[PDB]
Amino acid sequence: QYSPNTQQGRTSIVHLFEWRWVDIALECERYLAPKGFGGVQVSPPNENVAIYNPFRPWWERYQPVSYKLCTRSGNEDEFRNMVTRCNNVGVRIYVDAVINHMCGNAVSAGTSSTCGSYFNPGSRDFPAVPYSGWDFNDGKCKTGSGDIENYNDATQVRDCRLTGLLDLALEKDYVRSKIAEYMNHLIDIGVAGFRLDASKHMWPGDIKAILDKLHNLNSNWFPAGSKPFIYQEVIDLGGEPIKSSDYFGNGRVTEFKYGAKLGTVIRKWNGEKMSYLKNWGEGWGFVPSDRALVFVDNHDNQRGHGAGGASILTFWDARLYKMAVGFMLAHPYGFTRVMSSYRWPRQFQNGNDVNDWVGPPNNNGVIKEVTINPDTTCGNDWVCEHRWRQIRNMVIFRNVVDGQPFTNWYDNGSNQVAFGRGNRGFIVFNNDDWSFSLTLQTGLPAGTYCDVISGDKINGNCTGIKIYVSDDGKAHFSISNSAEDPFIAIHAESKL
Ligand SMILES: OC[C@H]1N/C(=N\O)[C@H](O)[C@@H](O)[C@@H]1O[C@H]1O[C@H](CO)[C@@H](O[C@H]2O[C@H](CO)[C@@H](O)[C@H](O)[C@H]2O)[C@H](O)[C@H]1O
Ligand SMILES: *[C@@H]1O[C@H](CO)[C@@H](O)[C@H](O)[C@H]1NC(C)=O
Ligand SMILES: OC[C@H]1N/C(=N\O)[C@H](O)[C@@H](O)[C@@H]1O
Ligand SMILES: [Ca+2]
Ligand SMILES: [Cl-]
């Protein structure tokens, strides 16, 4: 559960949020594999509630009805087709496993689901699994509302309903087996791992009992004895009885303090500066590198639904976001996850977004296809951050510098920083309100290098800035605070 199971030399995964299976399959072949992306985190593939008030929100997918592979993203045949085509081209598939709960208790009984399966939240009947009232935590929860009321009581956070979501009794072997049957069906299809949703709301021992029932990965693509990659979503910002370290024996954990602090540093909040990033990682109270799944923003906090607050950098903050994603992809700490989103009509009323519910670009409920524009960007309101030159080239930078140590740090005591990754890469940042013009030590061999941020290396030449490294590793870098991208990155493969 700790090893990504990605192809050797591919170091990042991308969250293709709300994308259809046929579009991910095409993306695996046309972009992800040629550009060196390791994998894809997909939205929940299991049947969910079709919520019409409000109109088909993104969050309806976090309300399971059954374990049938039938969603707005596609059916079972389309899912298998995607997994097979992606694996054959070396791009892994990771499933967002929503296993803590079923739907909200206030949801109406009927067939208002993505595959037409009947369900009754009131009587706790989900015949398509099958689950009954005996499979839920209604008698185990000791709160007066039945929902989670206080986060200082570790027991209720696990045994009660997260905002009304019917809590599955995970101590029961029947419930563990039904979840394992679902996860094993997916492993055998070819998925490389899972995102365990709402892990904070499940007991570490209960998760371990479910993982013990899991198969090794499909031996047609993976070597014998390969265990599925497990990354648990535990939102731990400190100061709670539940720690993300309680989950280390099961797999990796999502490090939310990472995106929160990188956001405050780059926005320069509370006097924080980039020079403090010298000891970035464990020195800041984060989980150990080999247990961390890192990201700048996720599907939740990019629209204010998880934790991190107003500090979180998203595609809306384009210029600062590319620097954050650039820093993340260059720094050795943890396993990296790149976000790929869609544009929604943000509307701030009293400091908060009233349109945070808005689902994926659609036509009367049917999710729109990802159309490709002539400049490699996406149409139909898909932002496609993974396709932006600055982000795409930084994904390749991480691949080229894999295994190299953190060396040659420089800082001006403010926000102009720089570091190298052994003898394979170097990156410089300028987040100050003045220009940077200095000669720094790189650790890289002599030659002419293309800046992968301002341009590309197309047939023996650079389309952007050129950096000249001398015999002793020194190189002059000139970055203006007025530049579209106030950072320069050069690596072993961008060399002329
Ligand atoms: O997996 C359950 C949550 N835990 C998660 N990680 O721990 C997901 O990342 C997050 O997206 C999920 O909440 C999302 O999915 C929930 C179910 O759809 C939404 O709740 C919604 O449904 C509830 C029950 O019907 C309502 O009470 C609530 O007001 C309504 O917003 C919630 O706001 C939305 O952030
Ligand atoms: C690179 O481009 C420049 C013009 O920008 C040109 O002078 C030079 O010959 C090109 N190099 C090669 C190797 O073609
Ligand atoms: O306790 C942290 C945070 N963690 C959560 N789940 O793990 C909740 O969705 C959110 O409501 C809660 O505030
Ligand atoms: Ca629970
Ligand atoms: Cl996450």
From Swiss-Prot:
Its cofactor is Ca(2+); chloride. Coiled coil: none annotated. Changing residue 337 to A: Abolishes chloride binding; has only slight effect on activity. Detected in pancreas (at protein level). Disulfide bonds join 28-86, 70-115, 141-160, 378-384, 450-462. The gene is AMY2A. It catalyses: Endohydrolysis of (1->4)-alpha-D-glucosidic linkages in polysaccharides containing three or more (1->4)-alpha-linked D-glucose units. Keywords: Calcium, Carbohydrate metabolism, Chloride, Disulfide bond, Glycoprotein, Glycosidase, Hydrolase, Metal-binding, Pyrrolidone carboxylic acid, Secreted, Signal. Pfam families: Alpha-amylase (PF00128), Alpha-amylase_C (PF02806). This is Pancreatic alpha-amylase. Belongs to the glycosyl hydrolase 13 family. GO terms for biological process: carbohydrate catabolic process; carbohydrate metabolic process; polysaccharide digestion. CDD domains: AmyAc_bac_euk_AmyA (cd11317). The modification Pyrrolidone carboxylic acid is found at residue 1. It comes from Homo sapiens (Human). The active site is at 197 (nucleophile), 233 (proton donor). Glycans are attached at residue 461. InterPro entries: A-amylase/branching_C, A-amylase_C, Alpha_amylase, Glyco_hydro_13_cat_dom, Glyco_hydro_b, Glycoside_hydrolase_SF. Ca(2+) binds at residues 100, 158, 167, 201. Monomer. Binds to the sea anemone inhibitor helianthamide. Its EC number is 3.2.1.1. Chloride binds at residues 195, 298, 337. Binds 1 Ca(2+) ion per subunit. The record marks 300 as: Transition state stabilizer. GO terms for cellular component: extracellular exosome; extracellular region; extracellular space. It is an enzyme of class 3 (hydrolase). GO terms for molecular function: alpha-amylase activity; calcium ion binding; chloride ion binding.
